[PDB]
Amino acid sequence: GAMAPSYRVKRMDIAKNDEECVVNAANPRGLPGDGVCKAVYKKWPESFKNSATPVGTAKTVMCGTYPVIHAVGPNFSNYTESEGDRELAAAYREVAKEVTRLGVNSVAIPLLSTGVYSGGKDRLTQSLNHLFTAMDSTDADVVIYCRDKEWEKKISEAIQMRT
Ligand SMILES: [Cl-]
Ligand SMILES: [Cl-]
Ligand SMILES: [Cl-]
C-alpha cells in the first residue's frame, strides 16, 4: 500500500505516467481505438494480446512486467442513461479489484466514458464520482490523467473538497 494513500490529477498524456500500472479506456474488442486507447496502444502494444473483454469489466495484460488494466466503459450512444450509469460504475469496481490483486502502490487512471463514449454529454462529475466510489477502499496512490485545462481545475477542486 501507499504510506498515505492520495488522489492527484495531472494534465498530460497517460502514456508518460509515473505510476506502477495504467488503466486503459479500452474498447470491448481489444482494438487500437482512438484517444487514450490509441496512446496506450502505441506505448504498450504487447498488452493488447487477448485484451478483448465485455462492457463493465476490466482485463489486465502485462507489457513486460508493467500491468495494463483494460477497462471497458459503456458507449452512451448505445446505452440508456440508466444502463450506462450501471455499467460505468461496474467498470470502475473491476479496476479496483485488479489494482488490489496486482499489489501495486500507485495507478494512472483516465475518466472512463468521458470522450467518444460520452454520447456528446459532459460526464466529468458522473465518471469521477464512480471512480471515487470504487477506489476509496483501495490503498494505492491514484493519479487521474486528463487533457483539458478546465477539466484539470474541476477534478482538482473535487479532490480538495473531500480533504
Ligand atoms: Cl503530454
Ligand atoms: Cl471515452
Ligand atoms: Cl479531458
UniProtKB/Swiss-Prot annotation:
Changing D13A: Partial loss of ADP-ribose 1'' phosphate phosphatase activity. It comes from the Viruses. ADP-D-ribose binds at D13, N27, G35, G115, V116, Y117. Residues 4-163 form the Macro domain. It is found in: Host cytoplasmic vesicle membrane. In the N-terminus, the macro domain displays a mono-ADP-ribosylhydrolase activity. The central part called, the alphavirus unique domain (AUD) has a zinc-binding function. The C-terminus region, also called hypervariable domain (HVD), is mainly disordered and binds several host proteins. This intrinsically disordered domain contains 2 SH3 domain-binding sites and 2 FGDF motifs necessary and sufficient for the formation of nsP3/G3BP complexes. Seems to be essential for minus-strand RNAs and subgenomic 26S mRNAs synthesis. Displays mono-ADP-ribosylhydrolase activity. ADP-ribosylation is a post-translational modification that controls various processes of the host cell and the virus probably needs to revert it for optimal viral replication. Binds proteins of G3BP family and sequesters them into the viral RNA replication complexes thereby inhibiting the formation of host stress granules on viral mRNAs. This is Non-structural protein 3. Phosphorylated by host on serines and threonines. It is a peripheral membrane protein. Transmembrane segments: none annotated. Changing V36A: Partial loss of mono-ADP-ribosylhydrolase activity. Interacts with mRNA-capping enzyme nsP1. Interacts (via C-terminus) with host G3BP1; this interaction inhibits the formation of host stress granules on viral mRNAs and the nsp3-G3BP1 complexes bind viral RNAs and probably orchestrate the assembly of viral replication complexes. Interacts (via C-terminus) with host G3BP2; this interaction inhibits the formation of host stress granules on viral mRNAs and the nsp3-G3BP2 complexes bind viral RNAs and probably orchestrate the assembly of viral replication complexes. Interacts (via C-terminus) with host NAP1L1.
